[PDB]
Amino acid sequence: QTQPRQNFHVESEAGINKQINMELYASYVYQSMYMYFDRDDVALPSFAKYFKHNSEEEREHAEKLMKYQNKRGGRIVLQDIQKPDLDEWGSPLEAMQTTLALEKSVNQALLDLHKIADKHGDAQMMDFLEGEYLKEQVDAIEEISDHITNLKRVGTGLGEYMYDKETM
Amino acid sequence: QTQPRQNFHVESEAGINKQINMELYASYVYQSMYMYFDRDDVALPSFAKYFKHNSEEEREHAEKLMKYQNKRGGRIVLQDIQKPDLDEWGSPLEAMQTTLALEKSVNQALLDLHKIADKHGDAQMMDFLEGEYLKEQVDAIEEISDHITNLKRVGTGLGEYMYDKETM
Amino acid sequence: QTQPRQNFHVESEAGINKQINMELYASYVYQSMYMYFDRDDVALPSFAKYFKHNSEEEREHAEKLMKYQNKRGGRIVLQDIQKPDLDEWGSPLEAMQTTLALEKSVNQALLDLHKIADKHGDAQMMDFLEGEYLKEQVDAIEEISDHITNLKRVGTGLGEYMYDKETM
Amino acid sequence: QTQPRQNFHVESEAGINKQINMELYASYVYQSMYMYFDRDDVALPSFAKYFKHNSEEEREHAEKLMKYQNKRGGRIVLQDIQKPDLDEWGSPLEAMQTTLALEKSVNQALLDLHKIADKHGDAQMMDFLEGEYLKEQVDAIEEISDHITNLKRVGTGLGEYMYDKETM
Ligand SMILES: [Cu+2]
Ligand SMILES: [Cu+2]
Ligand SMILES: [Cu+2]
Ligand SMILES: [Cu+2]
């Protein structure tokens, strides 16, 4: 029943919970990369600054999702945040590639939550996602594919250094 | 056959009219409560200030729909504005409670109008509704449910006066 | 071997990892409380703001710990972040009591990491903990016990409201 | 028997003297490298600027110890300052590498002096060392190991010149 509940189906509420946890996994994985470039044997501190921002950015998307969950009458059920697969992510190009599939995975999750809110006619929730998440995911997915092509252009060695200084 | 008509079904035109009339009823009902907390034997000026705001909200929310009705080529068919059910709304709780079901009633009327734009392929009218009405309704519906909870906590007496001073 | 390693024992490195994960659990639990007071049926938004800060504050202690782990030659091994015990923490007094045992638990963990660095004569690590963590824990433990005594003084109802407005 | 002597064992006094002499050797060695990157056939002015800084760091680090030796009632027994092993330090890498082991050598000499304050119950002299020397040494030792990694990445040639311009 709750108090502000209207047009908010039970499947949608459990999807926001399932999505809240994945957005936290993204924040975790990005922090794992942050401190892979603060590692002294890599020492790319502007790459590290990138993932520190991106980790905080995703933690703010989870918060924006939980803040929405409370605004619609649902209740927040948190689950364990699983550790990232790797603890050492290789070259910058390799790590940026990992990020692409990550945000590409996080995107399709959002795209399927939108499909659920459509199933039970949740027009507002559809707008909230397509305005505050889908619009941002396509931005992040391009800017990551932008960094992928450049890191391939500059190559290794001096290329990995000069891309940290000038672009990041 | 009006100059700017495109993709605008007469069913959607009629819905905006019936919806304009309802958004005005909410202005009247909130104004009824405005001048209730200014009663000499109610004397809650900040609750009065809250409904003076909210009454002007709905009035400008109806003006936006009217401005949209002309923007799409429909014609504004006005109707009578019914007097509110009550002439006195009891405790601040029982007033806020009447407000919740009011916005909750208006939210469905907006949602059903959104279903009418979807029935006739009006992609624009969908975004206008879910962007400048449904988005606001969800926030307000929470905001009211936040006041109901706190009023139940502070209880009758000094708790009612304090909520007026510190929150409103 | 690594590159900057000196006087940094294997037990200490695994303790920083084990402590990094617990500091994240603290950040998680605090966020769970943050959104328990953004819940519309509780709606204490200055209590919620407290745990939003405290959750971010602990996430910055983990970062300060990982930043230290990289500065001393150790490597960061992350583990799963377990979900908080409860998803609804009861009255404010009850939640603040939970927090006390939390920071009291997180303290003794730090106190025992200090004992490990002492075992293998890690004078710097001892200073880093007793300057940047132990000094802050005793501050946080008092300010939480301060909030515990007051919430007992003001009681329930109007007391729980007026403490959110004036002090938080 | 000096005026401000308390808790200050002659073993600690002797250690500060031998440590003062070493902190000056690091000033000389860094100055040796300063005027090496100003050689007409090295011509790396930013690497020169780095060692002009670091040479003045150790000189002021010895002055702090001297100021502390007088602060505790000990007397400053100066000794000769040995010339550095080399008169030319090769590539920027092989120079930075010589610097790592230099600070790593100085860090142990500080740590062993800290063990001398602990052997004779000098709680203050412990905090002065671990507060204004050991804390800095850990940071510098990382900072050097960060430069070694990046120089190995950028490689000889244009990579050496670019690191001079963009990082130093
Ligand atoms: Cu995201
Ligand atoms: Cu409205
Ligand atoms: Cu902490
Ligand atoms: Cu020094």
Side-chain angles (χ1 to χ4, degrees), chain A residues 38-45 92 157-158 160-162, chain D residues 142 145-147 149-150 153-155 158-159 162-163 167:
Chain A
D38 195 53
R39 276 178 75 170
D40 71 278
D41 60 15
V42 175
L44 302 174
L158 187 63
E160 295 161 330
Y161 175 80
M162 283 305 294
Chain D
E142 176 170 26
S145 322
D146 277 26
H147 297 341
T149 290
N150 283 338
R153 194 194 308 274
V154 305
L158 164 62
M162 228 61 209
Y163 199 80
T167 279

PDB file of all heavy atoms in Angstrom, chain A residues 38-45 92 157-158 160-162 165, chain D residues 142 145-147 149-150 153-155 158-159 162-163 166-167, unseen atoms left out:
ATOM      1  N   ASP A  38      46.845   4.502  -9.616  1.00  0.00           N
ATOM      2  CA  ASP A  38      47.644   5.045  -8.528  1.00  0.00           C
ATOM      3  C   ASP A  38      48.749   4.086  -8.112  1.00  0.00           C
ATOM      4  O   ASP A  38      49.641   4.480  -7.353  1.00  0.00           O
ATOM      5  CB  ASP A  38      46.760   5.378  -7.321  1.00  0.00           C
ATOM      6  CG  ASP A  38      47.463   6.272  -6.311  1.00  0.00           C
ATOM      7  OD1 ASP A  38      47.977   7.336  -6.719  1.00  0.00           O
ATOM      8  OD2 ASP A  38      47.501   5.915  -5.112  1.00  0.00           O
ATOM      9  N   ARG A  39      48.703   2.844  -8.593  1.00  0.00           N
ATOM     10  CA  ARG A  39      49.798   1.909  -8.387  1.00  0.00           C
ATOM     11  C   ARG A  39      51.094   2.505  -8.913  1.00  0.00           C
ATOM     12  O   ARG A  39      51.130   3.085 -10.002  1.00  0.00           O
ATOM     13  CB  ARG A  39      49.501   0.584  -9.091  1.00  0.00           C
ATOM     14  CG  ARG A  39      48.650  -0.377  -8.282  1.00  0.00           C
ATOM     15  CD  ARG A  39      48.359  -1.638  -9.078  1.00  0.00           C
ATOM     16  NE  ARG A  39      49.528  -2.508  -9.144  1.00  0.00           N
ATOM     17  CZ  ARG A  39      49.515  -3.753  -9.610  1.00  0.00           C
ATOM     18  NH1 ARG A  39      48.386  -4.287 -10.061  1.00  0.00           N
ATOM     19  NH2 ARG A  39      50.634  -4.466  -9.626  1.00  0.00           N
ATOM     20  N   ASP A  40      52.162   2.360  -8.127  1.00  0.00           N
ATOM     21  CA  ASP A  40      53.429   2.992  -8.481  1.00  0.00           C
ATOM     22  C   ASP A  40      54.034   2.390  -9.744  1.00  0.00           C
ATOM     23  O   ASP A  40      54.773   3.076 -10.459  1.00  0.00           O
ATOM     24  CB  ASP A  40      54.410   2.874  -7.318  1.00  0.00           C
ATOM     25  CG  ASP A  40      54.911   1.460  -7.132  1.00  0.00           C
ATOM     26  OD1 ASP A  40      54.204   0.652  -6.492  1.00  0.00           O
ATOM     27  OD2 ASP A  40      56.010   1.153  -7.638  1.00  0.00           O
ATOM     28  N   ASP A  41      53.741   1.123 -10.038  1.00  0.00           N
ATOM     29  CA  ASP A  41      54.271   0.489 -11.241  1.00  0.00           C
ATOM     30  C   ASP A  41      53.472   0.821 -12.494  1.00  0.00           C
ATOM     31  O   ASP A  41      53.810   0.326 -13.575  1.00  0.00           O
ATOM     32  CB  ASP A  41      54.350  -1.032 -11.060  1.00  0.00           C
ATOM     33  CG  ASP A  41      52.997  -1.669 -10.784  1.00  0.00           C
ATOM     34  OD1 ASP A  41      51.952  -1.021 -11.006  1.00  0.00           O
ATOM     35  OD2 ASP A  41      52.983  -2.830 -10.323  1.00  0.00           O
ATOM     36  N   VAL A  42      52.418   1.625 -12.372  1.00  0.00           N
ATOM     37  CA  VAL A  42      51.672   2.110 -13.526  1.00  0.00           C
ATOM     38  C   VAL A  42      51.758   3.630 -13.530  1.00  0.00           C
ATOM     39  O   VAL A  42      52.238   4.234 -14.496  1.00  0.00           O
ATOM     40  CB  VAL A  42      50.211   1.627 -13.496  1.00  0.00           C
ATOM     41  CG1 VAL A  42      49.431   2.254 -14.634  1.00  0.00           C
ATOM     42  CG2 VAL A  42      50.151   0.108 -13.566  1.00  0.00           C
ATOM     43  N   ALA A  43      51.285   4.249 -12.450  1.00  0.00           N
ATOM     44  CA  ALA A  43      51.491   5.669 -12.169  1.00  0.00           C
ATOM     45  C   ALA A  43      50.985   6.556 -13.307  1.00  0.00           C
ATOM     46  O   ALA A  43      51.710   7.383 -13.862  1.00  0.00           O
ATOM     47  CB  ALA A  43      52.965   5.952 -11.868  1.00  0.00           C
ATOM     48  N   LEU A  44      49.715   6.366 -13.650  1.00  0.00           N
ATOM     49  CA  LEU A  44      49.039   7.267 -14.572  1.00  0.00           C
ATOM     50  C   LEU A  44      47.985   8.039 -13.791  1.00  0.00           C
ATOM     51  O   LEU A  44      46.809   7.653 -13.776  1.00  0.00           O
ATOM     52  CB  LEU A  44      48.423   6.499 -15.741  1.00  0.00           C
ATOM     53  CG  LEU A  44      49.431   5.677 -16.546  1.00  0.00           C
ATOM     54  CD1 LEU A  44      48.723   4.833 -17.590  1.00  0.00           C
ATOM     55  CD2 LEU A  44      50.477   6.583 -17.188  1.00  0.00           C
ATOM     56  N   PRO A  45      48.369   9.133 -13.126  1.00  0.00           N
ATOM     57  CA  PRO A  45      47.467   9.766 -12.154  1.00  0.00           C
ATOM     58  C   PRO A  45      46.330  10.570 -12.767  1.00  0.00           C
ATOM     59  O   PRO A  45      45.403  10.937 -12.031  1.00  0.00           O
ATOM     60  CB  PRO A  45      48.410  10.669 -11.348  1.00  0.00           C
ATOM     61  CG  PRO A  45      49.499  11.004 -12.301  1.00  0.00           C
ATOM     62  CD  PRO A  45      49.680   9.802 -13.187  1.00  0.00           C
ATOM     63  N   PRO A  92      46.325   0.742 -20.377  1.00  0.00           N
ATOM     64  CA  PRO A  92      45.164   1.652 -20.372  1.00  0.00           C
ATOM     65  C   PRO A  92      44.122   1.270 -21.411  1.00  0.00           C
ATOM     66  O   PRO A  92      42.924   1.220 -21.098  1.00  0.00           O
ATOM     67  CB  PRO A  92      45.794   3.028 -20.642  1.00  0.00           C
ATOM     68  CG  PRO A  92      47.244   2.874 -20.307  1.00  0.00           C
ATOM     69  CD  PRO A  92      47.593   1.457 -20.613  1.00  0.00           C
ATOM     70  N   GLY A 157      53.869   2.925 -24.733  1.00  0.00           N
ATOM     71  CA  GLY A 157      54.993   3.756 -24.342  1.00  0.00           C
ATOM     72  C   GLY A 157      54.680   5.234 -24.230  1.00  0.00           C
ATOM     73  O   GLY A 157      53.843   5.641 -23.418  1.00  0.00           O
ATOM     74  N   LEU A 158      55.363   6.049 -25.043  1.00  0.00           N
ATOM     75  CA  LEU A 158      55.145   7.493 -25.013  1.00  0.00           C
ATOM     76  C   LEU A 158      53.706   7.854 -25.361  1.00  0.00           C
ATOM     77  O   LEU A 158      53.198   8.891 -24.915  1.00  0.00           O
ATOM     78  CB  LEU A 158      56.119   8.189 -25.968  1.00  0.00           C
ATOM     79  CG  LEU A 158      56.162   9.723 -25.946  1.00  0.00           C
ATOM     80  CD1 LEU A 158      56.622  10.238 -24.598  1.00  0.00           C
ATOM     81  CD2 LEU A 158      57.057  10.260 -27.053  1.00  0.00           C
ATOM     82  N   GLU A 160      50.961   6.186 -24.378  1.00  0.00           N
ATOM     83  CA  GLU A 160      50.157   6.066 -23.167  1.00  0.00           C
ATOM     84  C   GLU A 160      50.422   7.213 -22.200  1.00  0.00           C
ATOM     85  O   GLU A 160      49.536   7.583 -21.422  1.00  0.00           O
ATOM     86  CB  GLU A 160      50.429   4.729 -22.483  1.00  0.00           C
ATOM     87  CG  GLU A 160      49.990   3.522 -23.285  1.00  0.00           C
ATOM     88  CD  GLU A 160      50.670   2.249 -22.826  1.00  0.00           C
ATOM     89  OE1 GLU A 160      51.817   2.329 -22.336  1.00  0.00           O
ATOM     90  OE2 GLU A 160      50.056   1.168 -22.950  1.00  0.00           O
ATOM     91  N   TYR A 161      51.628   7.781 -22.229  1.00  0.00           N
ATOM     92  CA  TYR A 161      51.937   8.909 -21.358  1.00  0.00           C
ATOM     93  C   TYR A 161      51.299  10.198 -21.861  1.00  0.00           C
ATOM     94  O   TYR A 161      50.630  10.906 -21.099  1.00  0.00           O
ATOM     95  CB  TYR A 161      53.452   9.082 -21.234  1.00  0.00           C
ATOM     96  CG  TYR A 161      53.852  10.314 -20.451  1.00  0.00           C
ATOM     97  CD1 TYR A 161      53.826  10.321 -19.062  1.00  0.00           C
ATOM     98  CD2 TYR A 161      54.249  11.474 -21.104  1.00  0.00           C
ATOM     99  CE1 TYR A 161      54.187  11.449 -18.348  1.00  0.00           C
ATOM    100  CE2 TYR A 161      54.610  12.604 -20.401  1.00  0.00           C
ATOM    101  CZ  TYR A 161      54.578  12.587 -19.025  1.00  0.00           C
ATOM    102  OH  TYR A 161      54.939  13.715 -18.329  1.00  0.00           O
ATOM    103  N   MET A 162      51.502  10.525 -23.138  1.00  0.00           N
ATOM    104  CA  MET A 162      51.039  11.808 -23.647  1.00  0.00           C
ATOM    105  C   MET A 162      49.521  11.905 -23.688  1.00  0.00           C
ATOM    106  O   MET A 162      48.986  13.019 -23.713  1.00  0.00           O
ATOM    107  CB  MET A 162      51.613  12.064 -25.040  1.00  0.00           C
ATOM    108  CG  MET A 162      53.064  12.510 -25.022  1.00  0.00           C
ATOM    109  SD  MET A 162      53.333  13.959 -23.981  1.00  0.00           S
ATOM    110  CE  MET A 162      52.423  15.212 -24.867  1.00  0.00           C
ATOM    111  N   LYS A 165      48.449  13.109 -20.123  1.00  0.00           N
ATOM    112  CA  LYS A 165      48.697  14.518 -19.842  1.00  0.00           C
ATOM    113  C   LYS A 165      47.738  15.418 -20.615  1.00  0.00           C
ATOM    114  O   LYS A 165      47.065  16.271 -20.026  1.00  0.00           O
ATOM    115  CB  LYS A 165      50.151  14.867 -20.162  1.00  0.00           C
TER     116      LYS A 165
ATOM    117  N   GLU D 142      57.530   7.097  -2.736  1.00  0.00           N
ATOM    118  CA  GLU D 142      56.547   6.860  -3.789  1.00  0.00           C
ATOM    119  C   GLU D 142      56.785   7.785  -4.974  1.00  0.00           C
ATOM    120  O   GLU D 142      56.862   7.332  -6.122  1.00  0.00           O
ATOM    121  CB  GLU D 142      55.123   7.050  -3.270  1.00  0.00           C
ATOM    122  CG  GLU D 142      54.100   6.896  -4.392  1.00  0.00           C
ATOM    123  CD  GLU D 142      52.668   6.833  -3.913  1.00  0.00           C
ATOM    124  OE1 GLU D 142      52.378   7.382  -2.830  1.00  0.00           O
ATOM    125  OE2 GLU D 142      51.828   6.245  -4.629  1.00  0.00           O
ATOM    126  N   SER D 145      59.431   6.562  -7.154  1.00  0.00           N
ATOM    127  CA  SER D 145      59.020   5.346  -7.850  1.00  0.00           C
ATOM    128  C   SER D 145      57.972   5.623  -8.919  1.00  0.00           C
ATOM    129  O   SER D 145      57.844   4.839  -9.867  1.00  0.00           O
ATOM    130  CB  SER D 145      58.489   4.318  -6.849  1.00  0.00           C
ATOM    131  OG  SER D 145      59.239   4.344  -5.649  1.00  0.00           O
ATOM    132  N   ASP D 146      57.219   6.715  -8.788  1.00  0.00           N
ATOM    133  CA  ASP D 146      56.301   7.105  -9.851  1.00  0.00           C
ATOM    134  C   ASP D 146      57.060   7.617 -11.069  1.00  0.00           C
ATOM    135  O   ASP D 146      56.671   7.343 -12.211  1.00  0.00           O
ATOM    136  CB  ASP D 146      55.323   8.164  -9.340  1.00  0.00           C
ATOM    137  CG  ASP D 146      54.142   7.561  -8.600  1.00  0.00           C
ATOM    138  OD1 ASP D 146      54.279   6.447  -8.047  1.00  0.00           O
ATOM    139  OD2 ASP D 146      53.072   8.206  -8.574  1.00  0.00           O
ATOM    140  N   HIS D 147      58.151   8.356 -10.846  1.00  0.00           N
ATOM    141  CA  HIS D 147      58.935   8.872 -11.963  1.00  0.00           C
ATOM    142  C   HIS D 147      59.712   7.764 -12.664  1.00  0.00           C
ATOM    143  O   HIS D 147      59.889   7.812 -13.887  1.00  0.00           O
ATOM    144  CB  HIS D 147      59.889   9.967 -11.480  1.00  0.00           C
ATOM    145  CG  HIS D 147      59.201  11.175 -10.922  1.00  0.00           C
ATOM    146  ND1 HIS D 147      57.881  11.473 -11.184  1.00  0.00           N
ATOM    147  CD2 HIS D 147      59.658  12.168 -10.121  1.00  0.00           C
ATOM    148  CE1 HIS D 147      57.553  12.593 -10.564  1.00  0.00           C
ATOM    149  NE2 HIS D 147      58.613  13.035  -9.912  1.00  0.00           N
ATOM    150  N   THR D 149      58.807   4.601 -13.082  1.00  0.00           N
ATOM    151  CA  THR D 149      57.889   3.854 -13.936  1.00  0.00           C
ATOM    152  C   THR D 149      57.612   4.600 -15.235  1.00  0.00           C
ATOM    153  O   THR D 149      57.703   4.028 -16.328  1.00  0.00           O
ATOM    154  CB  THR D 149      56.583   3.587 -13.190  1.00  0.00           C
ATOM    155  OG1 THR D 149      56.814   2.629 -12.150  1.00  0.00           O
ATOM    156  CG2 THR D 149      55.524   3.058 -14.145  1.00  0.00           C
ATOM    157  N   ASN D 150      57.269   5.887 -15.131  1.00  0.00           N
ATOM    158  CA  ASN D 150      56.909   6.654 -16.318  1.00  0.00           C
ATOM    159  C   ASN D 150      58.095   6.834 -17.260  1.00  0.00           C
ATOM    160  O   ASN D 150      57.912   6.838 -18.483  1.00  0.00           O
ATOM    161  CB  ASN D 150      56.338   8.011 -15.906  1.00  0.00           C
ATOM    162  CG  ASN D 150      54.904   7.917 -15.416  1.00  0.00           C
ATOM    163  OD1 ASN D 150      54.189   6.966 -15.730  1.00  0.00           O
ATOM    164  ND2 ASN D 150      54.478   8.907 -14.637  1.00  0.00           N
ATOM    165  N   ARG D 153      58.436   3.873 -19.304  1.00  0.00           N
ATOM    166  CA  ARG D 153      57.394   3.832 -20.324  1.00  0.00           C
ATOM    167  C   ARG D 153      57.751   4.708 -21.519  1.00  0.00           C
ATOM    168  O   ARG D 153      57.751   4.242 -22.665  1.00  0.00           O
ATOM    169  CB  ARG D 153      56.055   4.267 -19.727  1.00  0.00           C
ATOM    170  CG  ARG D 153      54.858   3.945 -20.608  1.00  0.00           C
ATOM    171  CD  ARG D 153      53.609   4.687 -20.156  1.00  0.00           C
ATOM    172  NE  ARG D 153      53.331   4.493 -18.738  1.00  0.00           N
ATOM    173  CZ  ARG D 153      52.643   3.470 -18.242  1.00  0.00           C
ATOM    174  NH1 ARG D 153      52.153   2.540 -19.052  1.00  0.00           N
ATOM    175  NH2 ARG D 153      52.441   3.377 -16.935  1.00  0.00           N
ATOM    176  N   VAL D 154      58.061   5.984 -21.270  1.00  0.00           N
ATOM    177  CA  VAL D 154      58.278   6.926 -22.365  1.00  0.00           C
ATOM    178  C   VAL D 154      59.520   6.566 -23.172  1.00  0.00           C
ATOM    179  O   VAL D 154      59.625   6.924 -24.353  1.00  0.00           O
ATOM    180  CB  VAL D 154      58.354   8.366 -21.826  1.00  0.00           C
ATOM    181  CG1 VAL D 154      57.118   8.684 -21.006  1.00  0.00           C
ATOM    182  CG2 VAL D 154      59.612   8.559 -20.997  1.00  0.00           C
ATOM    183  N   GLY D 155      60.471   5.861 -22.567  1.00  0.00           N
ATOM    184  CA  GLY D 155      61.640   5.403 -23.291  1.00  0.00           C
ATOM    185  C   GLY D 155      62.615   6.502 -23.661  1.00  0.00           C
ATOM    186  O   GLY D 155      62.326   7.692 -23.498  1.00  0.00           O
ATOM    187  N   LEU D 158      62.788  11.163 -27.569  1.00  0.00           N
ATOM    188  CA  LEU D 158      61.741  12.161 -27.412  1.00  0.00           C
ATOM    189  C   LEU D 158      60.967  11.959 -26.114  1.00  0.00           C
ATOM    190  O   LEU D 158      60.472  12.928 -25.527  1.00  0.00           O
ATOM    191  CB  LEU D 158      60.797  12.115 -28.617  1.00  0.00           C
ATOM    192  CG  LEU D 158      59.424  12.787 -28.529  1.00  0.00           C
ATOM    193  CD1 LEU D 158      59.558  14.285 -28.304  1.00  0.00           C
ATOM    194  CD2 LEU D 158      58.607  12.496 -29.777  1.00  0.00           C
ATOM    195  N   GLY D 159      60.865  10.712 -25.649  1.00  0.00           N
ATOM    196  CA  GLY D 159      60.182  10.454 -24.392  1.00  0.00           C
ATOM    197  C   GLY D 159      60.864  11.113 -23.210  1.00  0.00           C
ATOM    198  O   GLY D 159      60.201  11.565 -22.273  1.00  0.00           O
ATOM    199  N   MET D 162      60.012  14.934 -23.430  1.00  0.00           N
ATOM    200  CA  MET D 162      58.615  15.232 -23.132  1.00  0.00           C
ATOM    201  C   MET D 162      58.335  15.166 -21.639  1.00  0.00           C
ATOM    202  O   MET D 162      57.623  16.019 -21.098  1.00  0.00           O
ATOM    203  CB  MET D 162      57.703  14.277 -23.896  1.00  0.00           C
ATOM    204  CG  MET D 162      56.586  14.994 -24.595  1.00  0.00           C
ATOM    205  SD  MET D 162      57.212  16.157 -25.806  1.00  0.00           S
ATOM    206  CE  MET D 162      55.881  17.338 -25.768  1.00  0.00           C
ATOM    207  N   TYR D 163      58.883  14.158 -20.958  1.00  0.00           N
ATOM    208  CA  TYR D 163      58.688  14.053 -19.517  1.00  0.00           C
ATOM    209  C   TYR D 163      59.234  15.282 -18.803  1.00  0.00           C
ATOM    210  O   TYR D 163      58.651  15.750 -17.817  1.00  0.00           O
ATOM    211  CB  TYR D 163      59.359  12.786 -18.991  1.00  0.00           C
ATOM    212  CG  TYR D 163      58.851  12.355 -17.640  1.00  0.00           C
ATOM    213  CD1 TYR D 163      57.658  11.658 -17.522  1.00  0.00           C
ATOM    214  CD2 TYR D 163      59.555  12.652 -16.482  1.00  0.00           C
ATOM    215  CE1 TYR D 163      57.182  11.265 -16.293  1.00  0.00           C
ATOM    216  CE2 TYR D 163      59.086  12.260 -15.243  1.00  0.00           C
ATOM    217  CZ  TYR D 163      57.898  11.564 -15.156  1.00  0.00           C
ATOM    218  OH  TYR D 163      57.416  11.166 -13.931  1.00  0.00           O
ATOM    219  N   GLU D 166      56.444  18.150 -19.516  1.00  0.00           N
ATOM    220  CA  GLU D 166      55.056  18.003 -19.093  1.00  0.00           C
ATOM    221  C   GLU D 166      54.877  17.616 -17.629  1.00  0.00           C
ATOM    222  O   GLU D 166      53.818  17.907 -17.063  1.00  0.00           O
ATOM    223  CB  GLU D 166      54.340  16.965 -19.970  1.00  0.00           C
ATOM    224  N   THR D 167      55.863  16.973 -17.001  1.00  0.00           N
ATOM    225  CA  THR D 167      55.721  16.493 -15.629  1.00  0.00           C
ATOM    226  C   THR D 167      56.590  17.250 -14.636  1.00  0.00           C
ATOM    227  O   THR D 167      56.105  17.668 -13.578  1.00  0.00           O
ATOM    228  CB  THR D 167      56.047  14.993 -15.558  1.00  0.00           C
ATOM    229  OG1 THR D 167      54.904  14.235 -15.970  1.00  0.00           O
ATOM    230  CG2 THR D 167      56.412  14.591 -14.140  1.00  0.00           C
TER     231      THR D 167
END
